[PDB]
């Protein structure tokens, strides 16, 4: 579940 909330937090800007 680690990958899934880095990808989250940088495509996010």
Do not use: V
């Given at each position: 579940?680690?990958?899934k909330?880095?990808?989250?937090?940088?495509?996010?800007?």
């Amino acid at each position: 579940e680690k990958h899934k909330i880095l990808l989250r937090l940088l495509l996010d800007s």
